[PDB]
Amino acid sequence: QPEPRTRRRAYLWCKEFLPGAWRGLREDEFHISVIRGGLSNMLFQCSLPDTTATLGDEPRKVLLRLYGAEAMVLESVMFAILAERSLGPKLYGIFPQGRLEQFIPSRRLDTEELSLPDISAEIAEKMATFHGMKMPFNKEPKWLFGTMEKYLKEVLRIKFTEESRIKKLHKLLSYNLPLELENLRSLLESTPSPVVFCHNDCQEGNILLLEGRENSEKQKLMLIDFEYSSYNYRGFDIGNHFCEWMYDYSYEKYPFFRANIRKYPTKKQQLHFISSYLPAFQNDFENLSTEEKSIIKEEMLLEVNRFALASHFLWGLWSIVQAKISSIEFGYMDYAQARFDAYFHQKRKLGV
Amino acid sequence: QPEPRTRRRAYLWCKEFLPGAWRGLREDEFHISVIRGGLSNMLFQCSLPDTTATLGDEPRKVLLRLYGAAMVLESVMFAILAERSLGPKLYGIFPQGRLEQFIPSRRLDTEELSLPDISAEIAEKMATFHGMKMPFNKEPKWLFGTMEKYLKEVLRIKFTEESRIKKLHKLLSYNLPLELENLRSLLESTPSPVVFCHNDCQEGNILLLEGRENSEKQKLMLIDFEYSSYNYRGFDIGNHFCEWMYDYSYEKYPFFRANIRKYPTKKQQLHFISSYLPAFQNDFENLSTEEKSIIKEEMLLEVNRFALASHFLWGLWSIVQAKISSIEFGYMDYAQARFDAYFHQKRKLGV
Ligand SMILES: CN1CCCN(Cc2ccc(-c3ccc(CN4CCCN(C)CC4)cc3C#N)cc2)CC1
Ligand SMILES: CN1CCCN(Cc2ccc(-c3ccc(CN4CCCN(C)CC4)cc3C#N)cc2)CC1
């Protein structure tokens, strides 16, 4: 149900980028609905009249994405490659204000569904698959600390007015974040983790349950929303996803999420995850001595659980930045504290 | 060999974007030599020590392209053609250039365009290029949109040296603005399907892949897609036809030769489209002999009319380049040649 400005532009983009019955479509026969509002990444559904016949390949329906409010070449290139490789939505139109993507009938996963075994198992293969991909991007694992550093620096020089924000900020600064960041760096630099191509934001909202596939056991999911992807420590991608088991963002009152540290996957669950990931990420694995299979798994658990620490720290720092620059209704500061609570609680669990 | 102020940048770009041996490579193991210097799109050949064994399936040798002297589209496109195996693989992409697959090869010379085998494959490859879907605007704005952009530039160009002034004055005296409109009226009444066109299909942009000079139908690749867009197919073919007449390897100023006689004969043209059509609508082969001729005769009128836009567009392009480019080349004489070819071709076609 868009506003007159968009939808007219939406109409123009579709008629000009989409082949088939689109190219002759009149404005008056153009259907567009909202999927998400806001000011950053607005989403719309666009479609032909149901009375209108497609001529060929062209889709009956597409997703319009407006970038809203030159790393945008990397994002664009990346998205086009995953499309060609069928890992992502097909790409029908790229232009300065946004893109036109394949519409994929689906819903997103809920937080509690992440712990379902088949779900978890598939997510593990998908992420594996994702990791084996060559991408024309810088292969140096600089993203994780480069990004945390960047946020830290921002964080240190931001000043709130509103009282409750000024308080929450000082308590977080109590921890001495620069010292802690460095503590975390040395801890992780001593933690071997293969640099690969990482989703980096693999949470339930960015995983699709594909329609008509809810019976297929290993084949009903697609990972989307690749905006944070980059070559990174594998441990981060897996640990960050483990961390997401703990957070529910569908909560309808301020601060608009629930943290539950008891929901972090158990040892048995993590093993169930990486037991799908591992054979999906390398060849000979399936038939290594059952004795050495364990050694890798046990080491992989220390790895992901350590890097899950970076997930807490990164997104905690990120969250604080969002509290200053974002207008979206979300308790970013409360969510900041939550991630640092988990950070230190997770610390005490690992004896590190 | 290159200058020190780039041999490093290149080493870093390679160490950091390429897998395999490239990961641990020491600055004193890095080999890099120039392919084409210049001011923009400087080419380089970066390679591993012959004494270094590759760890995986990483490339031993890669091409580095510096942008030097659009933007998102050009990069998406290259990534895509690489993903489809129409273009060189894309090994690394960054703000001031990119790493591409190095293809052992040489460029076609002008005269090779007319070898029946070479011009058959080019037709086939252009046809294949033409069937590709790309995430770009499918409205055929590019042709006259660019000619207007250039014409406006030209009517604004002011030259310093008396000669360029004379020449620009001989060109302006054709009344480009009125001529453009005569052209539009002609092409508007000339049916031509819109497709993804290479738009610059000249010999310098067609590689002859070394080690298959003997292949009959698989010895070429089209490259340099830097002008590619959705456009009237007639232009891509017409433009390529025009390129039979110009040889850019001439070593004395103005550094090209134009040769009207070397424009493809009806027979040669039919030979080209006879390869193109099968490759562009697979059913075409099964048509009635008589019907094929209907369509061929029809495509001849099409491509030869649009060849006019090739002369016009690039003629205007060449005046602009005279003022701005630092590449040594008689742009203004090339412009004059293209407009001569433009008016001669109008007379030939009686249009
Ligand atoms: C005020 N509103 C209440 C309920 C939802 N809402 C909009 C709304 C608001 C906020 C979110 C949301 C906020 C933070 C996070 C945490 N991040 C996880 C770590 C990294 N990912 C970079 C980026 C987000 C997730 C979600 C997620 N998913 C999602 C939707 C509409 C009305
Ligand atoms: C050291 N050198 C001295 C003299 C120039 N030189 C380099 C050199 C030689 C020729 C060209 C050159 C100039 C114009 C054109 C015409 N254009 C055709 C229409 C559109 N295509 C956009 C782009 C080019 C082609 C070439 C082509 N190919 C450009 C650079 C050779 C040794």
Tokens of A291: 């004795």
Domains of chain B, residue spans: 1-67+89-102, 68-88+103-351
- For ligand 2, residues with CB inside 6 Å are B 200, 202, 204, 227, 248, 255, 314, 327-329
Ligand 2 center to residue A76 CA distance, Å?
Answer: 32
For residue B263, give how far its alpha carbon lies from the nearest alpha carbon of chain A (Å).
Answer: 35
What region does A20 belong to: left with phi over 0, alpha with psi -120 to 50, or beta?
Answer: left
Angle between helix axes B266-280 and B116-131 (nearest 10 degrees) is 40
Using CA atoms in the order A133, A75, A45, A39, what is the torsion angle rounded to 10 degrees?
A: 140
- Return d(Cα B183, Cα B296) in angstroms, integer: 23
Among B47, B63, B55, CA closest to B98? B63
CATH of the domain spanning A68-89+104-352: 3.90.1200.10
Q: Do domains B1-67+89-102 and B68-88+103-351 have the same CATH topology?
A: no
Q: What does the DSSP 8-state code read for residue B282?
A: G
- Residue B227 per-residue DSSP state: T
Alpha carbon of B248 to ligand 2 centroid (Å) = 6
Looking up tokens 């506003």, which residue turns up? A3
B221 DSSP β-pair partners = B207
**B106, amino acid identity:** R
Residue A102 annotated in ligand binding: yes
**By C-alpha distance, which of B269, B264, B342, B328 is closest to B299?**
B269
- Other CB atoms within a 10 A radius of the CB of residue A122 amount to 20
CA of A330 to the centre of ligand 1 (A): 7
Atom 26, ligand 2: residue with shortest CA distance: B248
Q: Which of B18, B76, B137 sits opposite A76 (nearest CB)?
A: B76
Cα A299 from Cα A246, distance rounded (Å) = 23
Separation of alpha carbons A195 and A189, rounded Å: 12
How far is residue B337 from each of residues A36, B183, B251, B317, B319, measured CA to CA in Å? 57, 18, 17, 13, 12
| Pairwise CA distance, residues B114 & A219, whole Å | 52
DSSP A256: -
Question: Residue B23 and residue A134: Cβ atoms within 8 Å?
Answer: no
Contact indicator for B312, B147 with CB cutoff of 8 Å: yes
Q: Which of B18, B62, B72, B281 to mutate to test the interface with A (most CBs of A within 10 A)?
A: B72
Can you give the length of chain B in residues? 351
3 state SS of A37: coil
Q: Which of A49, A67, A58 has its CA nearest to residue A92?
A: A58
CA distances from B172 to B158, B178, B224 (A): 12, 11, 31
Q: Is B105 annotated as a binding residue?
A: yes
Question: Contacts of residue B135 in chain A, CB cutoff 8 Å?
Answer: 17, 80, 91-94, 99-100
Rounded distance, CA B149 to CA A161, Å? Answer: 51
Buried-exposed string B82-94: b where 16+ CB fall within 10 A, e elsewhere:
bbeebbbbbbbbb
Is A94 annotated to bind a ligand? Reply is no
Domain spanning B68-88+103-351: which CATH class is it, in words? Answer: alpha beta
CA distances from A116 to A31, A108, A121, A124 (A): 37, 14, 8, 12
A244 in ligand 1 pocket by Cβ < 6 Å? no
Task: State which amino acid sits at residue B42.
Answer: M
CA distances in angstroms from A179 to A152, A167, A185, A186, A341, listed in the order given: 11, 21, 10, 11, 17
Closest ligand 1 atom, residue A328 Cα? 9
Name the superfamily (CATH) of residues B1-67+89-102. Phosphorylase Kinase; domain 1 (3.30.200.20)
Does the beta-carbon distance from A76 to B72 stay under 8 Å? Answer: yes
Torsion of CA A220, A226, A232, A236, to 10 degrees: -60
Tell me the C-alpha to C-alpha distance, in Å, between residue A227 and each of A66, A198, B170. Answer: 14, 11, 54
**Six-digit token string for B299:** 């495509």
Nearest CB to B90 within list A72, A136, A139:
A136
- Residue B167 burial by CB count (10 A; 0-12/13-18/19+): exposed, middle or buried? buried
Two structure tokens written together for A145: 């600390």
CB distance A22 to ligand 1 below 6 Å: no
Residue A322 in contact with residue A238, Cβ under 8 Å?
no
Query: Nearest CA to A76 among A58, A93, A59?
Result: A93
**Quick one: CATH architecture of A1-67+90-103?**
2-Layer Sandwich (3.30)
Tell me which amino acid residue B112 is: E
Distance from the alpha carbon of residue B334 to the mean position of ligand 2, in angstroms = 10
For residue B69, the tally of other CB atoms under 10 A from its CB is 10
CA distance B263 to B126: 19
B9 is in an annotated binding site: no
Round to whole Å and give the CA distance between A300 and A273. Answer: 11
Name the closest-CA residue to atom 6, ligand 1: A329
CB A323 within 8 A of CB A165: yes
Supply the DSSP string of A313-333, one letter for each residue. Answer: HHHHHHHHHHHHH--SSS-HH
Cα–Cα distance measured from residue A333 to residue A320, given in angstroms and rounded to the nearest whole number? 6
